[PDB]
């Protein structure tokens, strides 16, 4: 699978998890929690993209310029 970031973004908006081929650390993906999600979660939030890093920790995802322009996005399956 060779998706762009924009295509990988609509996949995130529909509740699925995406990852990149040329990423260094493994078992790594992104997931998007909506405001209502984050609200029922904790009580106003905006949409927040997270990342399950290699250490099984959840951090706020920071898009690198490479990740934004990359074409190697795939869906977790």
Which residues lie near its own copies (CB under 8 A)?
4-7, 9-10, 13, 24-25, 32, 41-42, 44-50, 53-54, 56-66, 68-69
**Closest CB 77 distance from its own copies, rounded Å:** 21
**Closest CB 64 distance from its own copies, rounded Å:** 4
29 beta partners? 52
24 is in an annotated binding site: yes
Query: What residues form the annotated binding site for 3'cADPR?
Result: 23-24, 61, 67
């Amino acid at each position: 699978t060779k998706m762009s970031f924009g295509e990988a973004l609509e996949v995130l908006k529909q509740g699925m998890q995406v990852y990149r081929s040329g990423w260094n650390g493994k078992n790594m993906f992104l997931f998007l929690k909506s405001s209502d999600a984050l609200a029922s979660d904790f009580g106003v939030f905006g949409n927040i993209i997270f990342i399950k890093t290699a250490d099984n920790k959840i951090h706020a995802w920071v898009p690198s310029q490479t990740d934004v322009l990359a074409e190697d996005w795939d869906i977790v399956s």
